[PDB]
Design a protein around this ligand. Structure first.
Ligand SMILES: Cc1cc2nc3c(=O)[nH]c(=O)nc-3n(C[C@H](O)[C@H](O)[C@H](O)COP(=O)(O)OP(=O)(O)OC[C@H]3O[C@@H](n4cnc5c(N)ncnc54)[C@H](O)[C@@H]3O)c2cc1C
Ligand SMILES: Cc1cc2nc3c(=O)[nH]c(=O)nc-3n(C[C@H](O)[C@H](O)[C@H](O)COP(=O)(O)OP(=O)(O)OC[C@H]3O[C@@H](n4cnc5c(N)ncnc54)[C@H](O)[C@@H]3O)c2cc1C
Ligand SMILES: NC(=O)C1=CN([C@@H]2O[C@H](COP(=O)(O)OP(=O)(O)OC[C@H]3O[C@@H](n4cnc5c(N)ncnc54)[C@H](OP(=O)(O)O)[C@@H]3O)[C@@H](O)[C@H]2O)C=CC1
Ligand SMILES: NC(=O)C1=CN([C@@H]2O[C@H](COP(=O)(O)OP(=O)(O)OC[C@H]3O[C@@H](n4cnc5c(N)ncnc54)[C@H](OP(=O)(O)O)[C@@H]3O)[C@@H](O)[C@H]2O)C=CC1
Ligand SMILES: N[C@@H](CCC(=O)N[C@@H](CSSC[C@H](NC(=O)CC[C@H](N)C(=O)O)C(=O)NCC(=O)O)C(=O)NCC(=O)O)C(=O)O
Ligand SMILES: N[C@@H](CCC(=O)N[C@@H](CSSC[C@H](NC(=O)CC[C@H](N)C(=O)O)C(=O)NCC(=O)O)C(=O)NCC(=O)O)C(=O)O
Lengths: 462, 462
């Protein structure tokens, strides 16, 4: 027998939870299928525990400036286990909250792994029971990528971000491989907390898809903070030794000859090279649901799959892999399906991002190079500044703040904002609202500054 | 003999410096008269040294959460002199920078006290030499208010914010009198750094001209932080004792009888009750320049005095006593006079403010009560939230974040934003740009959130 619902959601992470809760508000009879822990990647092995560890890493820098600010320094060591336990308890509190959010909304929780059946009417099976609905959302997320053994023998001796959140002790020596925001964030946390840390990157700079100013500055701040950035470098092999792992690296700097280097006595090797969508065991083939070669579910601008009555949102689609994007796409879909708003969809332009580096990065809109491509070089003007935040006026340790505003056409429409510096994590949201509204530079310059702040520098560029 | 300029600016603080520099960019032959230190109140006894001391007071709270974040605590004491010396050096660096800014712009620096003469053509005298121009800006600022002895015998035993910045040691016991942002800020700094601190206020709450939510929350956070808030209380007399000062207080709570209390062994009594404009010795009468009963120079919307060719900006006019306001009004005036832009003026609506409390406050636009008065009760809707920032998910000490959005008319135009919480100091500027642009709630809700942050809560209110 087959139980019918108005809305069946596969995955109880950011996007699935948000979509199911909004549908239920509109009257849908909904169910969420979850094989592991409610809250998905964000709550369990993502945004939330990452941010707790970032706040911890900030405590390591307050510690270094304490004498400069008039206090006698602290001179004793970090205890990873203390914060690990507290972090785990917070995750458990959130798991209980999201279970209650579904129950309070009268959303059924189906525990187990869903896969599609070959029934012509779209139907899933979970633990040998069948469920159907006229609307089925796939919101199954992704997972970390690890190299194949055939490519990098010994790769399985490394961990990913998932294993990072299982660590019970600070690794003495860490090597992080990759050059995106997860690699950056994990390297910065491990180094701030006292691991002897290297970040191994294929080119000269991290965050190369970000504005060139951010890519440069982020790389410089990593080095200034004590992270060893191993440029033009790749792992060839990993071996277990008596003292941890030995990582065999090849370095090939332009203008130089390639060189092989062994990195001995590594405690933690962390692969932060990408994410793979979680679709292998969904039986998508049984209904002919379209994927790319990497397993991402293909969707249109309304989150429709190629099969009527089946949708997908969030990381499983491979576009803009952020919690607020999954949530917004999920809610817009709920209003389309259950409020009959045919034009309800997410705009994927001007989505803001923060990277929790040291100091944090904020960006929204087009890089300078993207703007030149779209508008023409003669129709783009940039304004920028670099300064030392007043926090550091009295400290021996320094960080900088860099900001870039990208403007298009005669009116100087603000089409991109890019920055790194103290406070940039909390500064960006409001500027993103202004950019989404089509703010011009005149709109920024007509807004009176707030002094003394870093944020005022964005409204006083000349 | 009389030297002539295009532009004569009386006072080398925020507004005078900004106005003179912009005029000189437009070709004006300008001079700045300064009797004390370039940079005025902001650089020397205001924004800048206040902010250094606020950053210091934040170091006192990182210290209290260090064990919770896995570090062994710091257990030794603050040394006021360390940071005082560093703070003074930074002020000296800024004095040298602003002198150079004028010199590099070919702006003459006239050192001494200016007063108007009785010459029918507006002319000032400084150290017995006369100067004239077709455009004279009065930008002389203000000074702290202290009670008259006739009113409060012994009031002169107290200090003001000026004396705060001369303190060479942390006072053991401090009593701050007043209920505005300076009183709040000074009480919070002194208490965080270890002074046994009381804040004496005439009514039940601080910041009563701010939105009611902020007034309430700020008072609660002061008390939670250990500041003793002495409500419905006023100073009657101050006496020198063997052990500091004795403050005689009268307390008169509604519903209760008045009571007199002596507060013994006070080391620092700080008056933070208002500001008086710096106009007493300008000889304004010699030209009939109009003032109010408190000595403020009266101006129109274009900063004109009642006398042709004479202007005033900044604190001397008594309206919106902030550094960015003096600067913006000064620059808009320079473009009016020297770029002939007859409509160039400052809009005094939607000026954003931050109060450096613990945690900081940010506000822009109308309070809920101001919006109801302007638009009608049936045409105002508020949205609000209160939460604990994720920073405190793992700490025993707590602070809250409260946010209020005030919306007008069917379209829900955002006419006010009010908040207190970690990060609110850097969060506000961008939201102020959106409000100045006429953002609606739909504009906020159409902007994708940044997670995990406090700032995302302002774009996800329901
Ligand atoms: C280390 C790290 C840090 C990050 N930091 C941030 C950050 O600061 N900010 C930000 O915005 N984003 C961040 N992200 C990204 C964010 O976590 C993801 O974009 C977001 O979780 C994706 O949500 P989702 O709904 O697509 O998938 P997920 O949250 O991954 O949820 C998918 C759910 O589906 C369940 N599932 C899968 N297959 C099945 C099946 N067949 N049957 C039943 N259940 C199934 C899974 O168990 C899971 O709970 C971070 C991610 C990582 C890994
Ligand atoms: C404790 C405190 C904290 C503050 N915190 C902030 C803050 O965080 N943010 C913010 O925006 N604002 C803050 N302010 C307010 C800010 O300092 C003032 O709004 C701003 O300095 C006013 O600028 P102004 O140009 O009007 O006057 P001022 O900067 O006061 O400059 C006037 C100048 O005129 C000179 N002068 C006066 N009379 C004469 C004369 N006849 N001849 C020659 N020279 C003369 C004075 O010596 C002085 O240098 C703070 C103020 C105080 C007191
Ligand atoms: N400007 C913006 O607004 C941007 C926002 N983002 C946001 O961040 C999300 C995640 O992006 P991002 O952090 O770039 O993600 P990635 O998962 O793509 O980052 C991993 C990076 O590591 C490198 N890498 C890939 N494979 C290997 C390998 N086999 N060995 C070593 N290194 C490898 C690549 O960088 P390299 O080529 O340098 O080696 C790659 O970009 C996006 O989906 C988007 O939401 C991302 C980019 C820009
Ligand atoms: N909502 C907004 O946007 C607001 C912004 N601001 C900004 O802040 C600037 C400064 O304002 P604010 O901090 O209010 O300034 P004030 O200098 O006016 O604050 C001093 C306060 O102390 C109290 N006080 C006055 N005289 C006495 C006395 N004799 N004894 C004891 N207490 C006394 C009063 O409060 P009480 O009546 O409670 O006793 C008074 O408001 C403004 O010019 C503006 O730029 C100010 C208000 C609102
Ligand atoms: N704001 C950042 C950076 C620190 C910073 O601002 N430091 C400068 C001194 S600030 S105090 C004097 C005041 N300046 C302002 O209010 C900023 C004006 C803004 N730049 C603008 O263009 O509107 C003032 O009196 N200005 C009058 C004038 O600008 O003419 C500074 O000088 N830095 C230079 C240095 O080398 O230190 C933060 O707070 O971190
Ligand atoms: N953001 C502040 C406050 C801390 C906070 O957000 N805590 C909550 C858990 S966040 S992780 C799960 C994620 N939630 C979000 O991305 C926020 C969505 C936002 N509220 C919105 O409405 O868009 C998610 O999976 N959400 C899916 C869903 O919302 O359905 C939390 O639960 N707090 C409650 C508590 O009692 O702790 C900060 O970062 O400080």
């Amino acid at each position: 027998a087959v139980a019918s619902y108005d809305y069946l959601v596969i995955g109880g992470g950011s996007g699935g939870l948000a979509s199911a809760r909004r549908a239920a508000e509109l009257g849908a009879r909904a169910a969420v299928v979850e094989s592991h822990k409610l809250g998905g990647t964000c709550v369990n092995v993502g945004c939330v525990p990452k941010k707790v560890m970032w706040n911890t890493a900030v405590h390591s820098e307050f510690m270094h400036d304490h004498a400069d600010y008039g206090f006698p320094s602290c001179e004793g060591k970090f205890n990873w286990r203390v914060i690990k336990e507290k972090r785990d308890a917070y995750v458990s509190r959130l798991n209980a909250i999201y279970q209650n959010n579904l129950t309070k909304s009268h959303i059924e929780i189906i525990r187990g792994h869903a896969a599609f059946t070959s029934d012509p009417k779209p139907t899933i099976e979970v633990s040998g029971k069948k469920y159907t609905a006229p609307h089925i959302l796939i919101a199954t997320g992704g997972m970390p990528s690890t190299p194949h053994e055939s490519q990098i023998p010994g790769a399985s001796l490394g961990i990913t971000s998932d294993g990072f959140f299982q660590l019970e002790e600070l690794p003495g020596r860490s090597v992080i491989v990759g050059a995106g925001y997860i690699a950056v964030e994990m390297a910065g946390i491990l180094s701030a907390l006292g691991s002897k840390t290297s970040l191994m990157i294929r080119h000269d700079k991290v965050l190369r898809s970000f504005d060139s100013m951010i890519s440069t500055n982020c790389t410089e701040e990593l080095e200034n903070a004590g992270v060893e950035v191993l440029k033009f470098s790749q792992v060839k092999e990993v071996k277990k030794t008596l003292s941890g792992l030995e990582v065999s690296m090849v370095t090939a700097v332009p203008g130089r000859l390639p060189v092989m280097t062994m990195i001995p006595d590594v405690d933690c090797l962390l692969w932060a090279i990408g994410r793979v969508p979680n679709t292998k065991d969904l039986s998508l083939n049984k209904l002919g649901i379209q994927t790319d070669d990497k397993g991402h579910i293909i969707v249109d601008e309304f989150q429709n799959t190629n099969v009527k009555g089946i949708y997908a949102v969030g990381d499983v689609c491979g576009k803009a892999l952020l919690t607020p994007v999954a949530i917004a796409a999920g809610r817009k879909l709920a209003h389309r399906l259950f409020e009959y708003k045919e034009d309800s969809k997410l705009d994927y332009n001007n989505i803001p991002t923060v990277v929790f580096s040291h100091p944090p990065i904020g960006t929204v809109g087009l890089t300078e190079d993207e703007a030149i491509h779209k508008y023409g070089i003669e129709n783009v003007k940039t304004y920028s500044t670099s300064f030392t935040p007043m926090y550091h006026a009295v400290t021996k340790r320094k960080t900088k703040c860099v900001m870039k505003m990208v403007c298009a056409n005669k009116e100087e429409k603000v089409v991109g904002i890019h920055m790194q510096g103290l406070g940039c994590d909390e500064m960006l949201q409001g500027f993103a609202v202004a950019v989404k509204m089509g703010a011009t530079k005149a709109d920024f310059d007509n807004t009176v500054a707030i002094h003394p702040t870093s944020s005022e520098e964005l409204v006083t560029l000349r």
